[PDB]
Design an enzyme around this catalytic site. Structure first.
Site, PDB file in Angstrom:
ATOM      1  N   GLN A   1       0.842  -1.226   0.000  1.00  0.00           N
ATOM      2  CA  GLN A   1       0.000   0.000   0.000  1.00  0.00           C
ATOM      3  C   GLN A   1       0.864   1.258   0.000  1.00  0.00           C
ATOM      4  O   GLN A   1       1.593   1.478   0.961  1.00  0.00           O
ATOM      5  CB  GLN A   1      -0.970   0.017   1.181  1.00  0.00           C
ATOM      6  CG  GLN A   1      -0.418  -0.558   2.478  1.00  0.00           C
ATOM      7  CD  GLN A   1      -1.251  -0.102   3.645  1.00  0.00           C
ATOM      8  OE1 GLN A   1      -1.511   1.082   3.825  1.00  0.00           O
ATOM      9  NE2 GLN A   1      -1.700  -1.058   4.437  1.00  0.00           N
TER      10      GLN A   1
ATOM     11  N   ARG B   1      -0.525   4.326  -0.186  1.00  0.00           N
ATOM     12  CA  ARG B   1      -1.408   5.231   0.589  1.00  0.00           C
ATOM     13  C   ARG B   1      -1.970   4.464   1.791  1.00  0.00           C
ATOM     14  O   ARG B   1      -2.562   3.387   1.594  1.00  0.00           O
ATOM     15  CB  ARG B   1      -2.520   5.798  -0.300  1.00  0.00           C
ATOM     16  CG  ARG B   1      -3.154   7.068   0.244  1.00  0.00           C
ATOM     17  CD  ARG B   1      -4.124   7.706  -0.732  1.00  0.00           C
ATOM     18  NE  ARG B   1      -3.465   8.401  -1.828  1.00  0.00           N
ATOM     19  CZ  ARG B   1      -2.980   9.640  -1.766  1.00  0.00           C
ATOM     20  NH1 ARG B   1      -3.059  10.337  -0.643  1.00  0.00           N
ATOM     21  NH2 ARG B   1      -2.403  10.174  -2.832  1.00  0.00           N
TER      22      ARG B   1
ATOM     23  N   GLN C   1      -8.936  10.027 -16.636  1.00  0.00           N
ATOM     24  CA  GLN C   1      -7.734   9.158 -16.742  1.00  0.00           C
ATOM     25  C   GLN C   1      -8.110   7.737 -16.337  1.00  0.00           C
ATOM     26  O   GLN C   1      -8.484   7.486 -15.194  1.00  0.00           O
ATOM     27  CB  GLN C   1      -6.594   9.700 -15.881  1.00  0.00           C
ATOM     28  CG  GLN C   1      -5.840  10.844 -16.541  1.00  0.00           C
ATOM     29  CD  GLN C   1      -5.141  11.705 -15.520  1.00  0.00           C
ATOM     30  OE1 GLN C   1      -5.410  12.896 -15.389  1.00  0.00           O
ATOM     31  NE2 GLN C   1      -4.250  11.093 -14.759  1.00  0.00           N
TER      32      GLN C   1
ATOM     33  N   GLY D   1      -4.451   4.486  -9.151  1.00  0.00           N
ATOM     34  CA  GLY D   1      -5.818   5.038  -9.282  1.00  0.00           C
ATOM     35  C   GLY D   1      -6.782   4.533  -8.229  1.00  0.00           C
ATOM     36  O   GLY D   1      -7.963   4.293  -8.581  1.00  0.00           O
ATOM     37  N   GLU D   2      -6.332   4.415  -6.979  1.00  0.00           N
ATOM     38  CA  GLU D   2      -7.167   3.898  -5.860  1.00  0.00           C
ATOM     39  C   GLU D   2      -8.344   4.839  -5.623  1.00  0.00           C
ATOM     40  O   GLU D   2      -9.461   4.332  -5.475  1.00  0.00           O
ATOM     41  CB  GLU D   2      -6.382   3.761  -4.557  1.00  0.00           C
ATOM     42  CG  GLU D   2      -5.664   2.434  -4.428  1.00  0.00           C
ATOM     43  CD  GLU D   2      -5.341   2.096  -2.989  1.00  0.00           C
ATOM     44  OE1 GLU D   2      -4.142   1.956  -2.664  1.00  0.00           O
ATOM     45  OE2 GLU D   2      -6.300   1.971  -2.203  1.00  0.00           O
TER      46      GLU D   2
ATOM     47  N   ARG E   1      -9.838   6.964  -7.662  1.00  0.00           N
ATOM     48  CA  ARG E   1     -10.772   6.813  -8.813  1.00  0.00           C
ATOM     49  C   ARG E   1     -11.647   5.579  -8.577  1.00  0.00           C
ATOM     50  O   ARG E   1     -12.876   5.689  -8.722  1.00  0.00           O
ATOM     51  CB  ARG E   1      -9.980   6.749 -10.126  1.00  0.00           C
ATOM     52  CG  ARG E   1      -9.240   8.042 -10.448  1.00  0.00           C
ATOM     53  CD  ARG E   1      -8.476   7.997 -11.751  1.00  0.00           C
ATOM     54  NE  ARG E   1      -7.282   7.165 -11.659  1.00  0.00           N
ATOM     55  CZ  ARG E   1      -6.067   7.523 -12.054  1.00  0.00           C
ATOM     56  NH1 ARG E   1      -5.856   8.719 -12.581  1.00  0.00           N
ATOM     57  NH2 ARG E   1      -5.056   6.682 -11.922  1.00  0.00           N
TER      58      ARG E   1
ATOM     59  N   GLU F   1       4.445   6.302  -8.858  1.00  0.00           N
ATOM     60  CA  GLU F   1       3.242   7.048  -9.327  1.00  0.00           C
ATOM     61  C   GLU F   1       2.602   7.797  -8.154  1.00  0.00           C
ATOM     62  O   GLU F   1       1.918   8.786  -8.420  1.00  0.00           O
ATOM     63  CB  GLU F   1       2.282   6.087 -10.031  1.00  0.00           C
ATOM     64  CG  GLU F   1       2.867   5.523 -11.309  1.00  0.00           C
ATOM     65  CD  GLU F   1       3.489   6.579 -12.210  1.00  0.00           C
ATOM     66  OE1 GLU F   1       2.746   7.508 -12.619  1.00  0.00           O
ATOM     67  OE2 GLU F   1       4.716   6.488 -12.482  1.00  0.00           O
ATOM     68  N   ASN F   2       2.958   7.451  -6.926  1.00  0.00           N
ATOM     69  CA  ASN F   2       2.387   8.091  -5.719  1.00  0.00           C
ATOM     70  C   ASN F   2       3.422   9.059  -5.144  1.00  0.00           C
ATOM     71  O   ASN F   2       3.022  10.109  -4.605  1.00  0.00           O
ATOM     72  CB  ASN F   2       1.966   7.041  -4.692  1.00  0.00           C
ATOM     73  CG  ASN F   2       0.590   6.467  -4.953  1.00  0.00           C
ATOM     74  OD1 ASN F   2      -0.409   6.999  -4.466  1.00  0.00           O
ATOM     75  ND2 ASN F   2       0.536   5.374  -5.695  1.00  0.00           N
TER      76      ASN F   2
ATOM     77  N   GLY G   1     -17.214  12.246 -15.862  1.00  0.00           N
ATOM     78  CA  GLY G   1     -16.769  10.851 -15.962  1.00  0.00           C
ATOM     79  C   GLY G   1     -15.340  10.710 -15.483  1.00  0.00           C
ATOM     80  O   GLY G   1     -14.758  11.730 -15.022  1.00  0.00           O
TER      81      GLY G   1
END
Lengths: 199, 199
Positions: free
Chosen positions: B17, B19, B41, B58-59, B61, B92-93, B38
């Site tokens: 994880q 996050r 990404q 993308g958690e 999202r 990415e985080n 909508g």
């Protein structure tokens, strides 16, 4: 539906600029991280007109690949009116949550374990200083309650850094409650931290 | 290459994880913003195995669409080994830059002009309080130098908010230099701000 490859040179950043200030320190870390594992999330664009694309989302990705020297970038084209683009362009930037300093620290430790790396190896890969890596990992030594304060964004990382020096859990916790309740800054934390080690 | 639609219920968040803390206030703003225009990404996933997908990126999202009640989500599948996934998942985080409070303010003003909206209309659309919207726009009235401090992240938005009350550019600037150099907090700024209006 289809991820598209589009010419980096035919792309213009959004007219209603959501981002005014762009840290090159960070953008270079991104270009470096893209050299290693590539662009993971394609950049969202609309067709500005004939053969030209207006960035909806992904300016940093675009600028990082530009520095990398890439001739095309992966995009997703969405047909949108000038109003829709500007709106979406602002929301994709308004709805961004940065990771908490403790989590940035935790992640650094994961990569240290996974790639079996030195703090120097991490700094080189993530495009930041050995200092920044070392100092952020040091926060994992702090008492759990201080760590929870960090995630709740109760205290800054600099408030916590000073508390590492006290080397007594109780003293650190006592100060933590003072910092949050008295609403002390980094200066007066450091000040108070020294006064205690002196006494 | 191909954006894919995948079952929201068959998706598991990354094992390593990145996050730990997730603000529902923000995630709801996202679910609201996704109801309107909508998911812009698509979410990056790998195949965890047979018919199951591990979130790369993308958690928020994913969780926002879950709250929206959507049965599938747009994804991009990338074949990756367990090590690659965990690494990318952290980068990415780690490489996320949040917008500066002045820019958040500027964006709010753009949407006010574009959708010709009231501060109440904005709050309802962006999923935040009328208070938060009003207070952030008020920063655009501040002197330019204070505004530049805000983007340079020299001062917090609360330091600046107090300076709005002084209603004298020079007094505000004089304090600004004190705040950054003396390294004052929000408390002692507000304190000093009152002392001046009293005197």
């Amino acid at each position: 539906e289809e991820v598209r490859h589009i010419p980096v040179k035919s792309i213009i950043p959004n007219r209603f600029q959501p981002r005014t200030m762009f840290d090159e320190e960070k953008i270079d870390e991104l270009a470096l991280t893209i050299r290693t594992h590539g662009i993971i999330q394609p950049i969202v664009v609309r067709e500005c007109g004939n053969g030209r694309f207006e960035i909806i989302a992904g300016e940093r990705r675009w600028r990082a690949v530009q520095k990398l020297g890439w001739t095309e970038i992966p995009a997703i084209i969405k047909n949108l009116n000038d109003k829709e683009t500007a709106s979406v362009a602002l929301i994709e930037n308004l709805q961004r949550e940065e990771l908490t300093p403790i989590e940035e620290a935790m992640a650094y430790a994961k990569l240290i374990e996974l790639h079996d790396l030195t703090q120097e190896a991490l700094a080189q890969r993530l495009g930041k200083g050995q200092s920044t890596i070392a100092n952020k990992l040091r926060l994992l030594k702090l008492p759990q309650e201080v760590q929870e304060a960090l995630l709740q964004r109760a205290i800054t990382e600099r408030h916590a850094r000073a508390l590492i020096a006290l080397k007594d859990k109780e003293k650190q916790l006592k100060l933590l409650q003072e910092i949050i309740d008295k609403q002390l800054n980094v200066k007066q934390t450091e000040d108070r931290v020294l006064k205690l080690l002196e006494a």
